[PDB]
Design a protein around this nucleic acid. Structure first.
Ligand SMILES: [Mg+2]
Ligand SMILES: [Mg+2]
Ligand SMILES: [Mg+2]
Ligand SMILES: [Mg+2]
Ligand SMILES: [Mg+2]
Ligand SMILES: [Mg+2]
Ligand SMILES: [Mg+2]
Ligand SMILES: [Mg+2]
Ligand SMILES: [Mg+2]
Ligand SMILES: [Mg+2]
Ligand SMILES: [Mg+2]
Ligand SMILES: [Mg+2]
Ligand SMILES: [Mg+2]
Ligand SMILES: [Mg+2]
Ligand SMILES: [Mg+2]
Ligand SMILES: [Mg+2]
Ligand SMILES: [Mg+2]
Ligand SMILES: [Mg+2]
Ligand SMILES: [Mg+2]
Ligand SMILES: [Mg+2]
Ligand SMILES: [Mg+2]
Ligand SMILES: [Mg+2]
Ligand SMILES: [Mg+2]
Ligand SMILES: [Mg+2]
Ligand SMILES: [Mg+2]
Ligand SMILES: [Mg+2]
Ligand SMILES: [Mg+2]
Ligand SMILES: [Mg+2]
Ligand SMILES: [Mg+2]
Ligand SMILES: [Mg+2]
Ligand SMILES: [Mg+2]
Ligand SMILES: [Mg+2]
Ligand SMILES: [Mg+2]
Ligand SMILES: [Mg+2]
Ligand SMILES: [Mg+2]
Ligand SMILES: [Mg+2]
Ligand SMILES: [Mg+2]
Ligand SMILES: [Mg+2]
Ligand SMILES: [Mg+2]
Ligand SMILES: [Mg+2]
Ligand SMILES: [Mg+2]
Ligand SMILES: [Mg+2]
Ligand SMILES: [Mg+2]
Ligand SMILES: [Mg+2]
Ligand SMILES: [Mg+2]
Ligand SMILES: [Mg+2]
Ligand SMILES: [Mg+2]
Ligand SMILES: [Mg+2]
Ligand SMILES: [Mg+2]
Ligand SMILES: [Mg+2]
Ligand SMILES: [Mg+2]
Ligand SMILES: [Mg+2]
Ligand SMILES: [Mg+2]
Ligand SMILES: [Mg+2]
Ligand SMILES: [Mg+2]
Ligand SMILES: [Mg+2]
Ligand SMILES: [Mg+2]
Ligand SMILES: [Mg+2]
Ligand SMILES: [Mg+2]
Ligand SMILES: [Mg+2]
Ligand SMILES: [Mg+2]
Ligand SMILES: [Mg+2]
Ligand SMILES: [Mg+2]
Ligand SMILES: [Mg+2]
Ligand SMILES: [Mg+2]
Ligand SMILES: [Mg+2]
Ligand SMILES: [Mg+2]
Ligand SMILES: [Mg+2]
Ligand SMILES: [Mg+2]
Ligand SMILES: [Mg+2]
Ligand SMILES: [Mg+2]
Ligand SMILES: [Mg+2]
Ligand SMILES: [Mg+2]
Ligand SMILES: [Mg+2]
Ligand SMILES: [Mg+2]
Ligand SMILES: [Mg+2]
Ligand SMILES: [Mg+2]
Ligand SMILES: [Mg+2]
Ligand SMILES: [Mg+2]
Ligand SMILES: [Mg+2]
Ligand SMILES: [Mg+2]
Ligand SMILES: [Mg+2]
Ligand SMILES: [Mg+2]
Ligand SMILES: [Mg+2]
Ligand SMILES: [Mg+2]
Ligand SMILES: [Mg+2]
Ligand SMILES: [Mg+2]
Ligand SMILES: [Mg+2]
Ligand SMILES: [Mg+2]
Ligand SMILES: [Mg+2]
Ligand SMILES: [Mg+2]
Ligand SMILES: [Mg+2]
Ligand SMILES: [Mg+2]
Ligand SMILES: [Mg+2]
Ligand SMILES: [Mg+2]
Ligand SMILES: [Mg+2]
Ligand SMILES: [Mg+2]
Ligand SMILES: [Mg+2]
Ligand SMILES: [Mg+2]
Ligand SMILES: [Mg+2]
Ligand SMILES: [Mg+2]
Ligand SMILES: [Zn+2]
Lengths: 119, 206, 126, 50, 50, 70, 87
RNA sequence: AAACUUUCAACAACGGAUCUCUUGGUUCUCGCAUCGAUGAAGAACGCAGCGAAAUGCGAUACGUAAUGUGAAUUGCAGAAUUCCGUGAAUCAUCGAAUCUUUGAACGCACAUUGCGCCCCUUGGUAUUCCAGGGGGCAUGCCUGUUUGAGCGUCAUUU
RNA sequence: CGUGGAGGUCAGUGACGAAGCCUAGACCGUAAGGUCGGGUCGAACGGCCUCUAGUGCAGAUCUUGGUGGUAGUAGCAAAUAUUCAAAUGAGAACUUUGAAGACUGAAGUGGGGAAAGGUUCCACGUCAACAGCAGUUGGACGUGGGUUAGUCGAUCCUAAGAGAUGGGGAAGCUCCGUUUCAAAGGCCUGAUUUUAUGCAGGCCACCAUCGAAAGGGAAUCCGGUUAAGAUUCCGGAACCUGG
RNA sequence: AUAUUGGCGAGAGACCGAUAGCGAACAAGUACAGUGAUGGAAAGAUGAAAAGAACUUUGAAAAGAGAGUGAAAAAGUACGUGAAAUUGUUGAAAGGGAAGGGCAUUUGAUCAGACA
């Protein structure tokens, strides 16, 4: 078998928590069975299911927070973009585009003209 | 250039009953004790390791290079030479073989092969194709597996289709008259290629 | 002749990419051409073999034999057929690994996607 | 030795576990080229250097 | 180290000269790049000359 | 399996990170059982063994097969 | 007696294992590692010891993180999700 | 005359040259700019139904999520519902997570799985003792906030 | 003359057998060498004109690998010593048991530990390698099992010493200093009865920390128990510390 | 516009061909030495396919002998070819303190060519 996330994401907060507690009894039992047996591969699909649930339990809690920090200075550093440490401290487009009032007047007044040769 | 020298081997000097080449020191491994560095040593450095600053290309006086390409062109008439070279021209009309300028406009391979034949290139076209052998060397796994003869060299004045129509038939080569190249005119330093000229091409010559 | 600058005629690179090609890659190299009859039928030359197509060996010692492909042994670069096997000496029986380029397809197992493939390749289906 | 840091006891544990013959089923694997365990270690013949 | 009636030479090869050998194998390559650059730049620069 | 039959004692392979406290509570929770004391030890393959004595009210053997093994 | 009877007493360690590089180069009395240099913030290495570097540089290990930077680079450091389609 | 020695040949040994091979190496050239306190490189210990390694991964452990593909995986066992499908796969891609013990490595130590303090919470009759769960406490420096020091020093009390 | 690679050619040889290797068989060359037959073999290869070089070995106490004569030879002779029979087993000078003769002689060939090893402990199976005869035996090999603590040790303390810190040197990796020309900290409760801990007294100025499994040090004993654990388990009977 | 024995991606060679080429074509910076700094190997090839030898027989077993598979076991997980040193067997010959060599012919063995 093996539980599928897109179904878990419709389940509720505490349906998921209870799912989990079930799967863990499930596992616990299997482990007792395993050592009375030549092999027990069902165990695999149970323990990848615990994975999936945790994955999806943690999935929702994260986008809970991600959203309520959406659009403010300061959000937990592990929701901030990751990029690259250097990148992360490069100037912003704004800071970089920044231009001296005097510089502007000149840009405006004498811009690079489009032109052609012939006559 | 680091090979053969990635060791800290010293010679043991004399008095240990053993030749004086450097030896890998330390122990516990079979490599240690062994002869190091020298060109006669297993895993030594080779003698006079090849460097990249060896001369590869060669300079020839431009005029002398022309003298050559001219001679080679001169010789693609002279049917003995062309014949001497491989090149099955026992049964082409005349030499130089000049063909309608229309040749340059052929877009279709099958059409281009058809033309070359009518003009007489059939036994040469067959001689390539008939001659694909496996390269005898180790060459045949350094990106040179097969071998074969040289076909006719179709020269034109304007590429209105002919280079691609012909570009897939075995041994046939194309050139524009303006260029014209000794490596193709005398393949292997043997004079006498089988050129098939277009009119346009034949008169651009002068 | 090759003409691009992102294709390579290098023998070593070639052989590497063959032998170390991932499973998904091997599905395509393991193609089989269609039977003369199917090729009119769907208007299409060849297809990546798959585990329930019907097939005719048309090369080799089992030339003439036919059966249902029972595995694609992608790992071994070889296709097995239920019906073409080795009788052993202990009277065990053992599959012969056949190469799909040495088969011809005689009935495609069909899928929503199979048809979608056949369509995508400019063919038609009956 | 004989009253040990946990760090040593642990390495010793990992060493025990590593100290078994080649599990024979691997031999049956497609393309398998491993015939025998070529990193076997014996307390008498070779020391762990901790 | 002096003999025959030869001209006195001055080949300066007493430093580790081999470590500083520039061979222009990329002569061909740079030229093309140099060409593609100008083709790129003529394009960018709209009708302007180069 | 003998300590179980003879000693009213359940042996578990237990987390290396767990202490006598955490082992005792975990048995108690996951099994209904009451714990008298918990002895522990590190096996020679780096895993922990818990010798869990149940109080006199529980039959560990009885537990053992109502958990599954035997 | 400078030879084998003296070897008889080799039973004390000059170095144990090094926490940072795991190597039995941790000089107990000196509390530093003859190999990696710990506890110096920096790692020991020398340009006269090339094999030595070759034996330890980035690449000789898992690269748990660096592994992935040029995938991530290749895709311009995308954030968000992949969407969907057909087939 | 045997045996023995020696030469040659056949067959058989010993050994692994030779020939043919090559998913390796070497050198050239073209394109490109991306490690880390948002914990890097490196280490240690672990993780599979049946693995010692190599590869992979981190108590969600030869993998979880997403996406593309469109039926494998395979040494064996296995699931079995998974095959006209939100779906096979030791598949590809990869945008989302998990990521033990550690390392510049940051509560203090460390030849110790050694020893504190703070907050929230739970159990034990508990603000204080004990135990479990979660979250924290290095250093230099910058801007700023708050609380202050000095007859360094200005003014204002009456 | 010969070899590895390269341009040309002979539409050269080849699974109806390329190359290689063997061959007191043949033939050409003064020679370097070349050619053939036959045997072996299994995927490639050669002639000519030219190109090119990491291009020819008997030697270098040459390198690596392999192999001889020496030779079934030196030798397997220290530590007093062995013997009968049974049993097992294909096989017994060598294993197991019984018997006997001895030895170590408590300054042990006894019973335990420290450093170091790291599973060698124990059970079952078991002999290809290993144990310089042997092997049915083993510290070998294969498969498992086994190390239980409030009181035993660590842990705490300080020793010689080591070593952060405000600092002072040094281009710098770093060196010096350790209570050092430093604004160096935390305790008992009272004040709270908005309320949980701000202030109200007052003391104390001691300046990190690491460093002993033989130094200092809170506290457990006897009986019984295992194939293998025991001041640790079971039993009984105690004691220390904190609350 | 310049640099680049690192890094990511690519296309290449009159380069090397398993004692060569990087030390590593392989569970190679491994196994192994060393207190440590460091040192650091060997090692690729059955066949198209395991079809990896059912079965019988001798043996305590390993194995041998038959059988069997295969295009081939003159390919049997010691595996393509399988040189030399060096070894066993068989056959032939010689040998009064070495052996081997030169010119020449007897003797034995062996063989080409050519007659027409
Ligand atoms: Mg899945
Ligand atoms: Mg930020
Ligand atoms: Mg050098
Ligand atoms: Mg000597
Ligand atoms: Mg070399
Ligand atoms: Mg050759
Ligand atoms: Mg040829
Ligand atoms: Mg297709
Ligand atoms: Mg195949
Ligand atoms: Mg020893
Ligand atoms: Mg003179
Ligand atoms: Mg100069
Ligand atoms: Mg000089
Ligand atoms: Mg350069
Ligand atoms: Mg310009
Ligand atoms: Mg009872
Ligand atoms: Mg304990
Ligand atoms: Mg001395
Ligand atoms: Mg020594
Ligand atoms: Mg010391
Ligand atoms: Mg120091
Ligand atoms: Mg540090
Ligand atoms: Mg590093
Ligand atoms: Mg082959
Ligand atoms: Mg290459
Ligand atoms: Mg290029
Ligand atoms: Mg794996
Ligand atoms: Mg599996
Ligand atoms: Mg989908
Ligand atoms: Mg994958
Ligand atoms: Mg986790
Ligand atoms: Mg620290
Ligand atoms: Mg800790
Ligand atoms: Mg401030
Ligand atoms: Mg202020
Ligand atoms: Mg020559
Ligand atoms: Mg040559
Ligand atoms: Mg060469
Ligand atoms: Mg001979
Ligand atoms: Mg002849
Ligand atoms: Mg023959
Ligand atoms: Mg032959
Ligand atoms: Mg072959
Ligand atoms: Mg020449
Ligand atoms: Mg040479
Ligand atoms: Mg010579
Ligand atoms: Mg020689
Ligand atoms: Mg020699
Ligand atoms: Mg020798
Ligand atoms: Mg003998
Ligand atoms: Mg003797
Ligand atoms: Mg003697
Ligand atoms: Mg004696
Ligand atoms: Mg005896
Ligand atoms: Mg006896
Ligand atoms: Mg006596
Ligand atoms: Mg006596
Ligand atoms: Mg005495
Ligand atoms: Mg004794
Ligand atoms: Mg003892
Ligand atoms: Mg030991
Ligand atoms: Mg024993
Ligand atoms: Mg034996
Ligand atoms: Mg032994
Ligand atoms: Mg022996
Ligand atoms: Mg023996
Ligand atoms: Mg054992
Ligand atoms: Mg064991
Ligand atoms: Mg005590
Ligand atoms: Mg403690
Ligand atoms: Mg200091
Ligand atoms: Mg201390
Ligand atoms: Mg102590
Ligand atoms: Mg003490
Ligand atoms: Mg007792
Ligand atoms: Mg017991
Ligand atoms: Mg005991
Ligand atoms: Mg008791
Ligand atoms: Mg009592
Ligand atoms: Mg009390
Ligand atoms: Mg480069
Ligand atoms: Mg190129
Ligand atoms: Mg070769
Ligand atoms: Mg090599
Ligand atoms: Mg060479
Ligand atoms: Mg090597
Ligand atoms: Mg290979
Ligand atoms: Mg080895
Ligand atoms: Mg082969
Ligand atoms: Mg071989
Ligand atoms: Mg094979
Ligand atoms: Mg046989
Ligand atoms: Mg055949
Ligand atoms: Mg054969
Ligand atoms: Mg042979
Ligand atoms: Mg063979
Ligand atoms: Mg066999
Ligand atoms: Mg062979
Ligand atoms: Mg004779
Ligand atoms: Mg003679
Ligand atoms: Mg004579
Ligand atoms: Zn270190």
């Amino acid at each position: 078998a093996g539980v599928k996330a897109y179904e878990l994401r419709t389940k509720s907060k505490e349906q998921l928590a209870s799912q989990l507690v079930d799967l863990k009894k499930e596992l616990a039992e299997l482990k007792v069975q395993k050592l009375s047996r030549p092999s027990l591969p069902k165990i695999k699909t149970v323990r990848k299911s615990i994975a999936c649930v945790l994955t999806v339990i943690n999935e929702q809690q994260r986008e809970a927070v991600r959203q309520l920090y959406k659009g403010k200075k300061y959000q937990p550093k592990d929701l901030r973009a990751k990029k690259t440490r250097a990148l992360r401290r490069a100037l912003t487009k704004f800071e970089a585009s920044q231009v001296t009032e005097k510089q502007r007047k000149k840009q405006i007044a004498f811009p690079q003209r489009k032109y052609a040769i012939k006559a | 250039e680091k090979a053969g020298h990635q060791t800290s081997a010293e010679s043991w000097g004399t008095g240990r009953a053993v030749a004086r080449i450097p030896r890998v020191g330390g122990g516990g491994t079979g490599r240690s004790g062994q002869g190091a560095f020298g060109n006669m040593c297993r895993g030594g450095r080779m003698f006079a390791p090849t460097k990249t600053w060896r001369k590869w290309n060669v300079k020839v006086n431009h005029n002398e290079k022309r003298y050559a390409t001219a001679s080679a062109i001169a010789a693609t008439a002279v049917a003995s030479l062309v014949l001497a070279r491989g090149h099955r021209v026992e049964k082409i009309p005349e030499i130089p073989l000049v063909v309608s300028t229309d040749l340059e406009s052929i877009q279709k391979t099958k059409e281009a092969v058809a033309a070359l034949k009518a003009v007489g290139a059939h036994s040469d076209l067959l001689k390539v194709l008939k001659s694909k052998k496996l390269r005898a060397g180790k060459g045949k796994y350094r990106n040179r597996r097969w071998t074969q003869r040289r076909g006719p060299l179709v020269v034109y004045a304007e590429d209105n289709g002919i280079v691609k129509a012909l570009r897939n038939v075995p041994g046939v080569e194309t050139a524009n008259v303006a260029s014209l190249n000794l490596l193709q005119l005398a393949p292997g330093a043997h004079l006498g290629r089988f050129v098939i000229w277009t009119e346009a091409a034949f008169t651009k010559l002068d | 002749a090759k003409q691009s600058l992102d294709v390579s005629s290098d023998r070593r690179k070639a052989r590497k990419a063959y032998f170390t090609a991932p499973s998904s890659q091997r599905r395509v190299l393991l193609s089989a051409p269609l039977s003369k009859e199917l090729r009119a039928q769907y208007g299409i030359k060849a297809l990546p073999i798959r585990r329930d197509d019907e097939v005719l060996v048309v090369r080799g010692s089992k030339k003439g034999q036919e059966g249902k492909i029972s595995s694609v042994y992608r790992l071994k670069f070889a296709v097995q057929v239920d019906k073409v096997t080795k009788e052993k000496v202990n009277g065990a029986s053992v599959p012969i690994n056949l190469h799909p380029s040495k088969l011809v397809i005689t009935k495609l197992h069909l899928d929503k996607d199979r048809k979608a493939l056949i369509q995508r390749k400019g063919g038609k289906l009956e | 030795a004989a009253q040990k840091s946990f760090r040593i006891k642990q390495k010793m544990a990992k060493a025990k576990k590593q100290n078994r013959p080649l599990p024979q089923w691997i031999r049956l694997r497609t393309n398998n080229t491993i015939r025998y365990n070529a990193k076997r270690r014996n307390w008498r013949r070779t020391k762990m250097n901790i | 180290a002096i003999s025959k009636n030869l001209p006195i030479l001055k080949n300066h090869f007493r430093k580790h000269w081999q470590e500083r050998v520039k061979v222009h194998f990329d002569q061909a390559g740079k030229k093309v790049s140099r060409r593609n650059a100008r083709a790129t730049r003529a394009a960018k620069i709209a009708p302007r000359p180069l | 399996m003998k300590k179980v039959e003879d000693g009213n004692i359940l042996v578990f392979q237990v987390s290396m990170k767990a202490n006598k406290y955490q082992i005792k509570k975990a048995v108690k929770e996951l099994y209904e059982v009451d714990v008298l004391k918990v002895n522990t030890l590190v096996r020679p393959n780096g895993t922990k063994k818990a010798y869990v004595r149940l109080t006199a009210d529980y039959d560990a053997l009885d537990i053992a097969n109502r958990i599954g093994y035997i | 007696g400078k030879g084998t009877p003296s070897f008889g007493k080799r039973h004390n360690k000059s170095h144990t294992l090094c926490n940072r590089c795991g190597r039995r180069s941790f000089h107990v009395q000196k509390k530093t590692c003859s190999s990696c240099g710990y506890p110096a913030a920096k790692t020991r290495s020398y340009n006269w010891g090339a094999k030595a570097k070759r034996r330890h540089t980035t690449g000789t290990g898992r690269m748990r993180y660096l592994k992935h930077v040029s995938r991530r680079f290749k895709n311009g450091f995308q954030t968000g999700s992949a969407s969907k389609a057909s087939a």
